Amino acid sequence: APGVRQTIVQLLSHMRDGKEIREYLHRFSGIDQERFAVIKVGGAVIQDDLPGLASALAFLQTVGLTPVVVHGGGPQLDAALEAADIPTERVDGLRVTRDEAIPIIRDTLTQANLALVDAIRDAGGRAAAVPRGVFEADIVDADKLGRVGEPRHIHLDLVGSAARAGQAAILACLGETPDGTLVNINADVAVRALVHALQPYKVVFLTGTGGLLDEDGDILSSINLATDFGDLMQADWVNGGMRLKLEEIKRLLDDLPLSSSVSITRPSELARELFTHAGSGTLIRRGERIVATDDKSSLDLGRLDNLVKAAFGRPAVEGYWDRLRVDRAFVTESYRAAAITTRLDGWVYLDKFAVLDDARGEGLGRTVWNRLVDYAPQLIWRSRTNNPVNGFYFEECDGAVRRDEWTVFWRGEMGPVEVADVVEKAFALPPTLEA
Amino acid sequence: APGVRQTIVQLLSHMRDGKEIREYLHRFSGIDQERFAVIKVGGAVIQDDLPGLASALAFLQTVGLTPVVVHGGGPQLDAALEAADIPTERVDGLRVTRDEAIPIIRDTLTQANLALVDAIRDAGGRAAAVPRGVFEADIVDADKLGRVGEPRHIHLDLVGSAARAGQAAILACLGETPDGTLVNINADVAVRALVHALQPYKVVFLTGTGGLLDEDGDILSSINLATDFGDLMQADWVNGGMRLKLEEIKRLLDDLPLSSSVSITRPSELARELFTHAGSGTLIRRGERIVATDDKSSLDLGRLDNLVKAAFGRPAVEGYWDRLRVDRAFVTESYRAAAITTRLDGWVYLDKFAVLDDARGEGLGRTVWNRLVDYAPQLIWRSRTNNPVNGFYFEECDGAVRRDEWTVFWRGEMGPVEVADVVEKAFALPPTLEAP
Ligand SMILES: CC(C)(COP(=O)(O)OP(=O)(O)OC[C@H]1O[C@@H](n2cnc3c(N)ncnc32)[C@H](O)[C@@H]1OP(=O)(O)O)[C@@H](O)C(=O)NCCC(=O)NCCS
Numbered sequence: 001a002p003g004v005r006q007t008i009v010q011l012l013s014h015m016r017d018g019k020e021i022r023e024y025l026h027r028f029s030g031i032d033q034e035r036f037a038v039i040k041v042g043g044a045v046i047q048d049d050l051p052g053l054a055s056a057l058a059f060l061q062t063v064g065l066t067p068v069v070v071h072g073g074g075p076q077l078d079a080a081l082e083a084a085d086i087p088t089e090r091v092d093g094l095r096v097t098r099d100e101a102i103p104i105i106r107d108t109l110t111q112a113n114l115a116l117v118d119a120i121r122d123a124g125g126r127a128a129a130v131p132r133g134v135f136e137a138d139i140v141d142a143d144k145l146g147r148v149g150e151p152r153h154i155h156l157d158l159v160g161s162a163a164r165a166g167q168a169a170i171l172a173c174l175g176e177t178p179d180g181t182l183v184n185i186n187a188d189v190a191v192r193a194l195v196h197a198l199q200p201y202k203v204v205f206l207t208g209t210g211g212l213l214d215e216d217g218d219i220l221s222s223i224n225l226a227t228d229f230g231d232l233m234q235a236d237w238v239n240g241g242m243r244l245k246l247e248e249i250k251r252l253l254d255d256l257p258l259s260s261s262v263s264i265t266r267p268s269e270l271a272r273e274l275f276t277h278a279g280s281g282t283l284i285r286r287g288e289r290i291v292a293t294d295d296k297s298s299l300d301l302g303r304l305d306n307l308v309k310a311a312f313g314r315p316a317v318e319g320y321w322d323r324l325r326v327d328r329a330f331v332t333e334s335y336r337a338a339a340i341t342t343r344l345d346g347w348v349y350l351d352k353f354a355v356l357d358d359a360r361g362e363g364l365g366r367t368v369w370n371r372l373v374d375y376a377p378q379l380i381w382r383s384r385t386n387n388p389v390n391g392f393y394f395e396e397c398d399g400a401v402r403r404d405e406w407t408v409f410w411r412g413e414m415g416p417v418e419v420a421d422v423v424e425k426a427f428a429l430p431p432t433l434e435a
Numbered sequence: 436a437p438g439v440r441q442t443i444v445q446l447l448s449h450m451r452d453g454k455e456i457r458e459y460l461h462r463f464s465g466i467d468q469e470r471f472a473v474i475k476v477g478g479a480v481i482q483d484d485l486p487g488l489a490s491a492l493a494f495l496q497t498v499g500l501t502p503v504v505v506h507g508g509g510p511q512l513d514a515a516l517e518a519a520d521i522p523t524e525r526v527d528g529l530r531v532t533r534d535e536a537i538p539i540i541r542d543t544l545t546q547a548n549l550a551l552v553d554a555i556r557d558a559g560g561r562a563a564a565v566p567r568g569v570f571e572a573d574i575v576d577a578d579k580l581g582r583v584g585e586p587r588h589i590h591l592d593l594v595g596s597a598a599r600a601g602q603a604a605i606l607a608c609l610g611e612t613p614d615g616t617l618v619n620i621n622a623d624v625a626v627r628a629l630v631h632a633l634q635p636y637k638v639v640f641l642t643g644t645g646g647l648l649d650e651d652g653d654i655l656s657s658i659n660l661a662t663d664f665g666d667l668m669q670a671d672w673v674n675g676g677m678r679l680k681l682e683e684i685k686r687l688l689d690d691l692p693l694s695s696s697v698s699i700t701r702p703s704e705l706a707r708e709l710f711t712h713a714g715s716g717t718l719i720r721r722g723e724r725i726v727a728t729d730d731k732s733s734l735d736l737g738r739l740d741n742l743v744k745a746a747f748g749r750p751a752v753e754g755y756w757d758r759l760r761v762d763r764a765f766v767t768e769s770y771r772a773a774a775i776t777t778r779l780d781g782w783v784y785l786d787k788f789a790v791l792d793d794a795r796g797e798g799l800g801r802t803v804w805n806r807l808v809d810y811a812p813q814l815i816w817r818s819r820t821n822n823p824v825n826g827f828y829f830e831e832c833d834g835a836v837r838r839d840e841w842t843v844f845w846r847g848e849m850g851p852v853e854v855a856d857v858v859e860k861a862f863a864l865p866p867t868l869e870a871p
């Protein structure tokens with residue numbers, strides 16, 4: 001109680017991710033009991049890597065947060081104890097469970113549950129076993145699915161306790177009925193119900209794969225449901241399986257504020273993912289729409305003049321804006337990330353790419369970038385040999401010429417000797433921000 | 436002890452620099468508690484920045500790491516030494532300090548000691564006051580230099596005590612003859628004797644400037660005495676002071692094991708310095724030497740084939756090694772890092788750069804590489820897209836062209852036409868290594 005809370009202040013204040021951590025914590029003080037963070041976790045995780053999952057969640061709690069873990073039984077019961085005590089598995093719609101199957105489920109869930117609760121503590125944490133008592137559900141089928149039910153009220157009583165106790169709540173997917181009868185609850189429906197009730201600021205999905213994947217099989221860093229979602233469903237390259245993950249994640253995020261955001265990762269990266277503007281693994285949000293224009297008189301110059309001053313660290317120089325010509329402006333509804341292109345001897349030129357810290361974190365920088373380079377297949381830009389955005393530029397560039405102070409990039413398909421003459425012109429261009 | 440450990444690690448394991456801090460712990464878990472560091476503090480730094488000082492020294496103490504911090508009063512001591520008076524004389528090259536200076540010196544350092552010890556604790560740490568009882572010296576010269584001495588034997592019992600208890604041992608520079616006589620001790624001669632006695636993994640020199648400087652006047656991230664010490668000592672931009680500093684830093688490091696490393700940095704930087712590849716100071720190793728040669732014959736190509744199978748995921752194609760026509764090669768004395776340069780339509784072109792993780796971190800990747808780009812001012816290379824070292828490449832290139840699979844870099848002033856030419860060539864060169 002004494003030594004912990006304190007000896008991480010005067011600890012992670014000498015660490016490198018340290019200031020950036022203290023700051024989510026503080027601002028993530030939309031405490032309200034357990035409004036902290038709901039976390040679904042695959043059954044094939046509690047199995048194939050417990051000590052990690054358990055170290056992961058222990059860190060959260062000893063750092064400040066109060067996770068509300070929910071868990072399934074996949075491998076451990078979809079296999080083992082049913083192909084074993086020989087009741088077999090009956091899949092109608094998707095998964096029924098006659099009377100004989102119940103004591104197997106009850107048995108196994110309270111096992112993994114406890115497995116996890118104890119593991120966390122083993123790993124430095126404080127946790128609380130909540131195997132039954134939260135999910136009150138009706139049995140909707142009877143003659144069909146046998147003994148499966150739907151969450152008709154959430155009981156936070158027991159969760160509430162753990163929260164004030166400094167413990168993580170570890171909840172299994174069993175629910176009584178209004179008459180006290182046991183029944184199974186697939187975790188998809190059960191995370192909806194819980195996440196509505198609590199209204200959390202964060203929603204993690206801990207999977208073995210620990211991510212969600214772009215067109216090129218790489219990890220999909222960030223999704224803007226507002227802009228990116230449409231194309232995403234109606235997209236040949238996104239499988240049916242993932243399409244659901246989406247149809248079902250929007251369903252979640254639409255039930256929460258815009259403060260809210262879901263994160264899919266694997267435990268070993270979960271922390272580096274909740275506390276870095278980088279991240280690791282897919283982060284999703286309702287996000288904002290982007291307005292795209294070429295009519296300057298259609299732009300909050302003063303608001304933008306703020307966006308720039310804030311992003312760069314210095315003020316644009318006098319009457320810079322009134323002069324500015326403007327080929328195309330892409331600005332996010334909130335004005336927290338913009339790109340403005342002028343022209344240069346007939347090349348699309350990136351005059352300002354300005355994005356704010358928290359805007360980078362919601363993955364909007366990326367979102368503005370995309371629409372820009374979906375506009376300008378040939379694009380020239382410069383940057384200071386300092387601006388730490390250079391590395392993001394270098395992976396988007398196709399060309400790059402370095403000098404002591406400036407660095408010109410291109411993203412067209414022209415060649416070293418074709419750009420040659422326009423590359424020189426960007427270097428020649430004068431600073432439009434001060435010292 | 437394995438109680439603290441277990442958990443204080445189960446935290447870092449999730450911190451960006453968690454891995455390197457975890458390692459230091461494990462290394463220095465028992466019996467070597469006092470073998471981790473010999474932190475020397477400028478008398479000037481206990482003056483202005485005492486709080487920040489304590490807060491670093493404190494942050495170490497609070498993760499497992501128990502320093503042996505040594506100090507020497509400096510300025511506050513000269514000011515006080517002129518108060519009473521009789522302050523001057525340097526007959527030799529060290530000061531002369533006579534009987535009258537003593538009572539002041541001892542009570543001046545003693546106070547500085549306490550000051551610091553109590554400071555570390557306020558900061559949150561745990562420390563020990565060792566104002567005297569560690570430095571047993573003989574007395575250099577009677578008449579000439581007064582009551583100055585030279586350390587002969589180090590009595591480490593008081594520091595094992597501290598270290599053993601999880602406490603940073605704060606040692607002040609005060610001597611004591613074998614006939615009991617108390618005596619003045621020069622900090623440098625005193626730190627050398629202690630680093631001997633202890634054989635630390637580290638020897639940190641804390642200052643205000645917090646780093647050594649290059650010809651440019653920027654900071655000198657590192658040094659590789661095996662290679663860099665000759666060059667540095669003939670250079671006309673390396674003044675006296677800095678020569679004399681490197682000299683001493685060498686005498687220490689020749690006396691420690693290989694793993695040892697001297698850092699000179701600033702209190703605010705100590706963490707970054709000791710737990711990031713980069714740090715915020717000048718870091719010095721004894722290091723290993725590099726050979727340069729036009730003479731493929733004169734190389735262990737069997738080793739090299741490994742160095743390159745181990746760096747890259749896979750090994751060179753069949754016959755790559757026979758075939759190869761070396762322009763120049765720089766291989767490190769241990770074949771943990773090598774640049775191999777061939778020729779391409781005239782230009783020097785970089786056919787192999789391979790640096791193992793362990794070597795990349797010790798700072799050899801750069802040592803080979805400076806040696807390369809020094810030989811080949813105009814250089815053309817290439818790298819795959821998914822290559823770890825592309826960022827360092829891009830920091831070092833003068834321009835670069837990127838295609839999906841590969842990327843061609845270059846250095847040196849080089850006309851557009853000159854460059855597009857050679858570039859389309861290096862894109863053409865076929866895989867000298869096997870595929871993924
Ligand atoms: C650009 C250049 C390198 C040549 O290649 P190119 O024919 O123009 O084609 P590009 O290099 O532009 O195409 C490469 C890019 O397309 C992109 N791309 C392709 N598929 C993609 C995908 N699924 N997702 C995202 N980006 C994708 C990339 O962003 C990539 O570069 P990257 O490595 O930074 O990611 C050029 O500077 C050049 O050398 N031109 C001169 C031509 C010549 O023959 N010169 C000789 C004498 S005149």
Ligand SMILES: N[C@@H](CCC(=O)O)C(=O)O
Nearest residue numbers: 786787788817818867868
């Ligand atoms: N990336 C390596 C060589 C890879 C290859 O050409 O096969 C280098 O340039 O040093």
